[PDB]
């Protein structure tokens, strides 16, 4: 659980070669706070009460119709084939540079490898 | 080329109808108008029976080509009309629509009638596709109108010609220009 996540290297049980192939990788913790606790409390109960939100649900802004998203997605992927602009490339390049340098420095700021592999995949 | 521009042409035509007045709060217009007496026919344009019948003022009757047997024989003549057929008033496709809107409150047989007009319209149009299916070698000095009506032709008008210029420019340049052994543009 979070024991591995507190201290160091027990992240996966299996391999780093599938730590390789993925871009955005997310911890899930449930760190405590009573405000957070109560707010989770009523938030789901107001959900969990009488099959609650038929009328006052969709009155939120524009967050609507996963149907629309089926159609919207099957459209938007089916047309546009973009690629970069010039000004994006240099800053992203330099950013990945500093990414690998910071990973290597944490390697050196602990005198031992403290990094994820700075891949071309990232 | 429009749905109403041709009614500035077509809707000005006349029939003769019956009103329920005699000469009105005004008598009569200085004009070709006839004297107004109820219970008797009067000749009018057809941009007004529109205005009148729905103003609950009058009855009305059609022309005579608005019938069955004429519109049962014109079609079979028109079948082998390799070129064109009988032309009762030559824009009856606009008169009939502005007729059959309201008047079928009391017109007779306003349905088999419609059937035939559609039956003749479609065929004559479709003929007016296949005329194209022989046009070779730039024949822009040879064509057909001989018993054409107009409500069919405006359905083509902007398409071909704004092309046909640069289309047959390659050959309209031929009887208008010169070059060496090959064809010119």
């Amino acid at each position: 659980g979070r024991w591995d996540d507190t201290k160091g290297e027990e992240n996966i049980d299996f391999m780093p070669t599938i730590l390789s192939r993925f871009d955005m990788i997310f911890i899930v913790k449930d760190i405590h706070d009573e405000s957070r606790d109560i707010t989770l409390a009523k938030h789901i109960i107001n959900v969990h009460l009488s099959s609650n939100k038929s009328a006052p649900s969709e009155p939120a802004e524009g967050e609507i119709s996963l149907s629309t998203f089926k159609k919207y997605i099957h459209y938007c992927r089916t047309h546009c084939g973009p690629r970069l602009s010039e000004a994006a490339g240099e800053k992203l390049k330099s950013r990945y540079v500093l990414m690998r340098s910071g990973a290597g420095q944490q390697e050196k700021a602990s005198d031992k490898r403290l990094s994820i592999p700075i891949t071309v995949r990232q | 080329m429009d749905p109403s521009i041709i009614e500035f042409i077509g809707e000005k035509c006349m029939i003769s109808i019956i009103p329920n007045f005699s000469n009105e709060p005004l008598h009569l217009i200085y004009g070709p108008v006839g004297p107004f007496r109820a219970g008797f026919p009067v000749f009018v344009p057809l941009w007004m029976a529109t205005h009148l019948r729905k103003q609950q003022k009058c009855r009305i009757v059609p022309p005579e080509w608005m019938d069955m047997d004429i519109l049962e024989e014109i079609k079979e003549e028109e079948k082998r009309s390799k070129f064109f057929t009988k032309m009762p008033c030559e824009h009856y496709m606009v008169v009939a629509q502005l007729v059959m809107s309201t008047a079928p409150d009391d017109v007779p047989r306003c349905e088999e009638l419609r059937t035939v007009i559609k039956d003749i319209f479609d065929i004559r149009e479709s003929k007016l596709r296949t005329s194209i299916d022989a046009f070779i070698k730039g024949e822009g000095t040879y064509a057909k109108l001989d018993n054409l009506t107009l409500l069919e032709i405006h359905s083509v008008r902007p398409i071909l010609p704004y092309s046909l210029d640069h289309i047959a420019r390659y050959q309209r340049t031929a009887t208008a220009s010169q070059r060496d052994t090959s064809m010119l543009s």
């Binding site: 009328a55 009155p59 | 103003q55 609950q56 079928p104 007779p108 349905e111």
Partner: protein
């Protein structure tokens, strides 16, 4: 009459069609038609309330002389309402009938269509405004006030032996020089016995809003089939003799059929598509025979249900047993009536009418009309109106009230119909959401009697029951609901109230009044009845509607007001 006064109607006007109603739109769209016919431009209006009315006139601060309002009028001596009216022509045509007399009198700026078999209120002005007691419109013995004021020579005039009129009895003193005031109050109060019989005990509705209008436009030679249908809509709203009365049903079977049947413009050639002239048939107020299966629509109406008690199981058992005698299949009881096969869906009503005579229901069948536009399908008598009420869709956009009005009036054309099915759908989902609360509230035992009535209150807002039409509908399904089965035969006859939360409006706890059972002609106390507690303590009450049976309060300023309003 206005076969003479209509010939006044050519100049400018304003045509106002007071707060939401089906009488309103049906009565007004015809006149929009009429008035773009004789080449007049005019003004139709949405009304949000009497204040909406007053600002509306305020925004129309011209001298439009031919002012017109319809289905309203009993609010004030409306010259007091509408001061700048000088000789301006107003027209009242309201069926909210218990109307003031100062609006009737003052034959200046009003239309007394006074025509009724009740000659009961003739001196109703001859003593309240015409007499008075302890008054200042008078002279004094001093020489500084030596001018004759508006000497009615009555109690309206002095009471110090100065009354040239009032020549029924003695002059100086009957028993005293001011027994004038004594007899003044004698007649005043002994006939406020009848004034308070008016307007302070009960209210009702009268006649049509727009069948008179049909006869008006009938005298100008118009056989507009659609106008028959629109007026039919206007009546079939409160044809509901349990809601508000028709009465004339078995007399309009002569009246309207005589309007329409005798003049047969085509007796032999009518088998055509478009608008084949209207018909008449005897059918139900079963909700929606047509586009739904039986078994859901046999379940959401009150009268079919309450007599056979289906929100508990056992009603379904006897239900199935009568489908048994009917021999409907259950699948067929769950396919749309039209979606059924033929012979069953022809013979359905043919059998049901006669062998429901014998099993607890007698009062489902009616007399009404229906017709085609074309070949799509055969629309129904009321399935417009139950699609209409579902268009009062109080969304938070702030435009949707007036916009839904404008939409509704743009609905009953033969054109706009993609929305009409929308109205049907919206109606159905609400219609079984009605039922969805009754089981919850009955068997939770929320029927608060609290003394002389039954009483309901609710807790939060539903988009159904934001507005009060749905609220009266709630109250008018539960009531039968509870009072069928929880009572002896003694206490089935008491009235009902119901709270109505408005989480929208900062907390106001809306209410609607409604009446006890099975007294069609004996109608509301609540023309004023609520106002008692308004006098006794009196807290932020409203009576904004020309509809009487309604108020609007604070969230929480009701209960003690109710404890006062016990009696």
């Amino acid at each position: 009459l206005r076969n003479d006064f209509y010939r006044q109607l050519v100049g400018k006007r304003i045509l106002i069609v007071v707060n939401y109603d089906i009488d309103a739109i049906c009565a007004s769209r015809i006149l929009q038609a009429l008035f773009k016919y004789d080449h007049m431009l005019y003004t139709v209006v949405p009304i949000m309330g009497v204040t909406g009315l007053k600002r509306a006139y305020g925004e129309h601060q011209g001298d439009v002389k031919y002012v017109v309002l319809v289905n309203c009028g009993g609010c004030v001596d409306i010259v007091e309402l509408l001061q700048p009216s000088d000789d301006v022509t107003f027209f009242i045509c309201d069926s909210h009938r218990p109307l003031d007399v100062c609006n009737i009198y003052s034959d200046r700026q009003v239309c007394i269509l006074g025509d009724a078999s009740l000659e009961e209120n003739i001196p109703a002005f001859e003593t309240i405004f015409y007499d008075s007691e302890g008054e200042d419109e008078d002279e004094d013995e001093s020489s500084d006030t030596e001018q004759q004021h508006d000497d009615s020579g009555a109690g309206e005039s002095d009471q110090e032996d100065q009354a040239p009129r009032s020549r029924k009895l003695s002059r100086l003193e009957r028993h005293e020089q001011r027994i004038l005031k004594q007899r003044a109050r004698r007649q005043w109060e002994s006939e406020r016995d009848r004034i308070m019989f008016e307007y302070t005990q009960f209210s009702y509705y009268g006649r049509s809003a727009a069948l008179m209008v049909f006869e008006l436009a009938w005298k100008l030679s118009k056989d507009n089939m659609d106008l028959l249908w629109w007026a039919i809509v206007g009546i079939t709203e409160q044809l509901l003799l349990g809601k508000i009365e028709s009465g004339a049903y078995t007399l309009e079977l002569e009246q309207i059929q005589s309007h329409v049947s005798r003049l047969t413009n085509k007796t032999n050639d009518q088998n055509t598509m478009s608008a084949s002239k209207i018909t008449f048939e005897n059918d139900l107020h079963l909700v929606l025979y047509r586009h739904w299966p039986v078994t859901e629509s046999m379940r959401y109406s009150r009268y079919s249900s309450c007599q056979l008690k289906l929100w508990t199981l056992r009603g379904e058992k006897r239900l199935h047993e009568l489908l048994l005698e009917m021999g409907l299949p259950l699948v067929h009881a769950r396919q749309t009536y039209g979606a059924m096969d033929l012979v069953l869906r022809k013979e359905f009503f043919s059998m049901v009418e006669r062998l429901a005579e014998k099993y607890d229901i007698a009062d489902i069948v009616y007399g009404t009309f229906t017709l085609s536009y074309g070949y799509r399908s055969r629309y129904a008598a009321a399935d417009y109106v139950y699609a209409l009420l579902a268009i009062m869709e109080s969304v938070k956009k702030h435009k949707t009230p007036e916009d839904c009005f404008l939409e509704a009036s743009d609905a009953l054309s033969r054109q706009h119909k993609q929305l009409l099915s929308a109205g049907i759908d919206q109606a159905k989902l609400l219609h079984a959401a009605v039922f969805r609360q009754v089981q919850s509230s009955l068997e939770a035992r929320q029927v608060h009697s609290a003394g002389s009535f039954f009483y309901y209150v609710l807790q939060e807002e539903h988009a159904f029951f934001s507005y009060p039409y749905a609220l009266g509908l709630l109250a008018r399904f539960l009531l039968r609901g509870h009072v069928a089965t929880s009572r002896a035969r003694q206490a089935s006859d008491l009235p009902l109230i119901a709270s109505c939360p408005l989480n929208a409006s900062e907390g106001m706890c809306l209410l609607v009044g409604i009446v006890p059972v099975r007294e069609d002609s004996p109608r509301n106390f609540f023309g004023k009845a609520f106002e008692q507690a308004a006098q006794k303590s009196g807290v932020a009450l409203l009576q904004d509607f020309f509809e009487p049976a309604v108020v609007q309060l604070r969230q929480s300023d009701l209960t003690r007001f109710l404890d006062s309003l016990t009696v």
